[PDB]
């Protein structure tokens, strides 16, 4: 994806965050688990409900096929009438196909910005504190415990 | 000690398309084509379809004697007439406007049958040997039942000169038509007559029909033609008949009571004893989506027509093997 | 020491919407849709409208008596003609293949009206009693102007046989009709003759007109019914009248002059005084937006019609409280 | 936003900074201000001006709707002439809607990008010269006085 | 010891365009759309199309003399004709429900003309006199070779009574025509009787045809007219004739051997000697693109029509100089 | 571009580079030279090709216009038939002319992205063992050979 978290750096998703879209997990003496970020999980909620409300409303007025009918002697409009109708009903297929199209693709990269943008804020926080290995984890200098921990996800680590 | 950040993965299955990457599985996802109907023909909120069967839209207007059924029909919210209707127009002919008539019925829901003219009024005409084998009914030679097959009178045909001006508020549609024989003598036989018209007149009409006498292939084991002719006649006006033969006279006449939504939609679908909010030709539609791909033609409460085979959004995110 | 990154914020109020989010308030906004209009009828690019008032294309052509204000016209941009004109066809009847003409004059800028049948020029027939209470002028019986109600002179109508060729460079609208009579003493009133016939010709027509006898109703006090029929005589050919009764010959026809943009309009609206580039039929525009919702009719240089309530681009960024 | 710079790590935008679209904020002994950057701002300009008249153009060829008139026993063809000419409008209204919508989301993401580029070409100046503090700012290790803040301004700093 | 990330550049040329910026330099891109055509007209899968040049789809399927050519013509992929072909209708007159012909037109690839009337079976009547200097082949006056100018047989023309019942398995295009002389004594000269009539019946037609008489201008040095009029005979049924003057008679009727797509092209290039799967109007287009700009109307296997100029797809990235 | 690579921070491409889209460049005691990187070339390829086939496959369903005649008394439909069918073509061609348009800055874009991806990486495992550059270049510390700096191509440095 276009922001090289999901399915990049970080490798694969995680069956053991049910809690939320995006989140942590930590791992020390006490022990190991996992915490989904509320703060982001609720604006990317937010995000995708109102597109896929945005879409649905944009597309509510589309072409009404109307019965017609035509004796023997008028085949020329009764062909106009068909090539017409189903004239608007291509245009429509074609709208609604490439608006699923484009907007799945931006769905899949808004969700690899919102890992990207959680791990950036962490990074920024950690500094010189802790080893970035590369897969989406910090290792620590010095020991973290579980309230050193909650720091980190809180935005109130140092 | 070490923290990480990560993302959702589930058992999801689900898969969508992006105009990079075809079936890419993703943790949610949301379809919004409905693809099924029930495949049948149902009410619509509650309110029966006018269901012809075997009859025509002429076949029940005109009054063909198999269209018995319909002789009064209650409030359609829709029409349903197979592709080749086996009772249309008995006696053979035509039906002179009889598209722009269909058209008119989509903007009708319903009709209430009122006597123009009596059967009993005609003193100088008999009224009761206009029949033919062609319309049959209980095996005995009918006709249509909202129009006459008007003969003369001990070898006597007197010009008529018939008026009816519509007193009902309402609007009115008055059929009539006119009898093509096959040769001179059929004429002298029914009509006496052998050069004849029919002359209509209302406030905007302006109408004389000629019998167009010719020789042609037997059409139900006829070779006469009937022609059917119809106007719209408005509160307050006056409607003029003159014709010294050939005429079929309206009897019976339309009042349009409603003005509403409908289709005359094609199908060789019976009645389902449902009810729906949206109907098709093929099935009843009930879903919340916000597209359906069943059919063009619907009315009701509908998702729009796409001609796809799937559309479908992805809410979450790439779901990791 | 502490050197920032950083961008612009502002005061601005100005929200656009996005797929994701609405209402977003940004620093600076583009809008490119015109709401507005002056809610008058203007003079197109200097050139003014013709504009009928009360009378219609019909009561305009054939020269109702009431439509004196548009015996000579002007060149016009456009033409604007009421939902329902009063003044159409005083005299009741049809205007015949009506709409097409209505069409032709989308593409004709400026008319000049030339005598083609003076009206001393009849010789064995009256032409100065056909007059009717139908189309009044000042009080007294009087009729379309353009066309001549032609009658017996001293109980005879001998068989007309009139010719015109167009020398004129230009294309010529011939305008003429018929008379259709309620009653056989009518005809003979009128006429003298009881059967009777119009044909016209010209290279491409090819036409016999046979007056419709039939009581109807009273149209503005009138039984009988004229029918308006017309032609386009090109340059070099001849327009052939035969007629021995109800014909209404020709006095009048238009030359085309001028073949531009044009369009007939309804509205309900009067003259405006004003001048435009732009111009529909609830008022004029003047704007340098792309789009505009006023309405989808417009003439001259107009931006592209939307039915948008909104539509606004960002330019700037999204601006902080 | 996709790029995480605007209302993202830099919280909010600067009422003082009146010069351009995006620059710098300094802080030192001689005083305090703010520069905007002439370049990224001027490429700004270009981008979006170009796209306004991308959008205007692509539009020009829209349907144009022609008055047409039928006696009473045409209803079918002025049914058909209604349905067209509303058929058009429907397309071409839903297409205009659809281009602004999904052209301001463009837009916005557009200046977030700029941003946090021009961000991180000042990060990859400063290097271990200055504390990365995670609000959009850099806090220098030694005296950084006017020309020295001019320097990083200028792309000339080491 | 120094790595370094980096891209592809090249010394493309080809440019490509985005929203925000133009003539884009990139090292590698797609052009979709294809501008080139031969402008020939040629085969299409073989198939030869019916060439017209100045014959008329009128005059060919009447047999007009000068398109002796087209007496007997092979299965076609598509029909050419001018814009205006000089070789139509040679006697002056109209062609009934013409476009509608056409139409059914393009859903015909192969007519086999076959003899229905012959011209040795008018017994009553004179069918080798029936010719016009309107109408000229080698020199001397012909007429149209499919139909049959009936003239009275030693001053006497009985009243004509024929029946063709098509026992071919195919539908059967029946031609035939009525003539409209200038005045009485032609009336009398060629057919003898004064007031005429062409009745013609099938079990759908119900047509009665009266000669209008008139004088009108000389169009190709006549001022006589025919009218001409078709009809689809359909497998066992019968087309029954009744005339006592001014019948132009069928003497050929085609049958429709295959039906297949195909279309009517205006164009007036002539055929080109070449082989194609994709014909214009202009020429034809050999291209694997999946667009192209060439003309709107095409036959065949070919890529979809935008009013483009360019349409080119950048696949590769920025160059850089 | 939006992701600061491409004719940004990595200031023009390779004309030496003729082994794929993305890759590297190598300078130490040994000599110098570039390796295509095969991976994210190949996606590029997968990506961009199944993009073109989408656009192509898309546009497909286009109106197709018929040639239909009317008398000289038919001026109202021959009218109705001409503004349809322009209509159409209209719709269409804008339609095409707007999704390569879009595509083609969504096409500049993926490549930009790909870049920067592909360096992030390379920035990931160099870590405090290499210097950035700040132009696409890491110059490392210690002395790096052939089978070092194959490496890093690698994704096993360390
Ligand atoms: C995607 O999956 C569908 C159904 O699961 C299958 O029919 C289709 O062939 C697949 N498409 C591709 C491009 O692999
Ligand atoms: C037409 O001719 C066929 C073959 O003789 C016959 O079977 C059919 O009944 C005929 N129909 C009419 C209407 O004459
Ligand atoms: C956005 O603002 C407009 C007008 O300011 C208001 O009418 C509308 O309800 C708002 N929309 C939403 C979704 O809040
Ligand atoms: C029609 O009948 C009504 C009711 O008698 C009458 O008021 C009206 O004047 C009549 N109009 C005509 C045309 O006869
Ligand atoms: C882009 O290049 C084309 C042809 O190379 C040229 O005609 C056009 O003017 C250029 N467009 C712009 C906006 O510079
Ligand atoms: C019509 O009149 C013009 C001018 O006299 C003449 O040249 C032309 O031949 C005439 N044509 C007919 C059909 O009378």
Wanted: include cysteine.
């Amino acid at each position: 994806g276009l922001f090289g978290a999901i399915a990049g750096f970080i490798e694969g998703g995680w069956q053991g965050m049910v809690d939320g879209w995006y989140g942590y997990h930590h791992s020390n003496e006490q022990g190991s688990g996992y915490a989904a970020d509320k703060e982001s999980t609720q604006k990317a909620i937010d995000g995708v409900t109102n597109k896929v409300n945005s879409i649905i409303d944009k597309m509510n007025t589309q072409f009404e096929a109307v019965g017609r009918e035509f004796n023997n002697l008028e085949r020329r409009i009764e062909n106009l009438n068909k090539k017409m109708e189903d004239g608007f009903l291509d245009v429509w297929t074609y709208n609604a196909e490439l608006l699923v199209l484009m907007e799945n693709e931006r769905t899949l990269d808004f969700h690899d910005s919102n890992v990207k943008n959680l791990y950036d804020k962490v990074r920024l926080q950690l500094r010189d504190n802790a080893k970035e290995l590369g897969n989406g984890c910090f290792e620590f200098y010095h020991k973290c415990d579980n309230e050193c921990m909650e720091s980190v996800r809180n935005g109130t680590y140092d | 000690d070490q923290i990480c950040i990560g993302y959702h993965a589930n058992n999801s299955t689900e898969q969508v398309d992006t105009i990079m990457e075809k079936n890419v599985t993703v943790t949610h996802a949301q379809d919004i084509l409905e693809k099924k109907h029930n495949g049948k023909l149902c009410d619509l909120d509650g309110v029966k379809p006018l269901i012809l069967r075997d009859c025509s839209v002429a076949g029940w207007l005109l009054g063909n004697p198999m269209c018995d059924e319909f002789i009064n029909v209650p409030e359609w919210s829709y029409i349903v007439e197979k592709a080749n209707p086996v009772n249309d127009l008995c006696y053979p002919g035509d039906f002179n406007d009889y598209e722009e008539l269909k058209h008119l019925l989509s903007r009708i829901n319903h009709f209430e049958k009122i006597q123009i003219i009596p059967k009993s009024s005609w003193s100088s005409h008999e009224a009761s040997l206009g029949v033919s084998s062609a319309c049959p009914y209980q095996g005995k030679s009918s006709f249509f039942r909202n129009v006459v097959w008007l003969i003369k009178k001990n070898s006597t045909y007197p010009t008529i000169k018939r008026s009816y001006n519509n007193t009902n508020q309402e609007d009115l549609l008055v059929l009539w038509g006119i009898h093509h024989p096959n040769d001179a003598a059929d004429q002298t036989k029914l009509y006496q007559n052998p050069t004849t018209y029919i002359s209509v007149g209302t406030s905007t009409l302006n109408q004389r029909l000629v019998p167009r006498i010719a020789t042609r292939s037997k059409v139900n084991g006829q070779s006469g033609r009937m022609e059917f002719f119809w106007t719209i006649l408005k509160p307050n006006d006056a409607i003029n008949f003159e014709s010294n033969g050939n005429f079929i006279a309206p009897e019976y006449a339309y009042k349009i009571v409603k003005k509403g939504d409908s289709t005359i939609m094609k199908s060789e679908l019976e009645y389902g004893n449902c009810n729906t909010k949206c109907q098709t030709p093929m099935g009843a539609i009930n879903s919340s989506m916000p597209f359906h791909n069943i059919h063009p033609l619907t009315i009701g409460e509908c998702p729009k027509y796409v001609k796809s085979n799937r559309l479908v959004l992805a809410t979450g995110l790439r779901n990791s093997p």
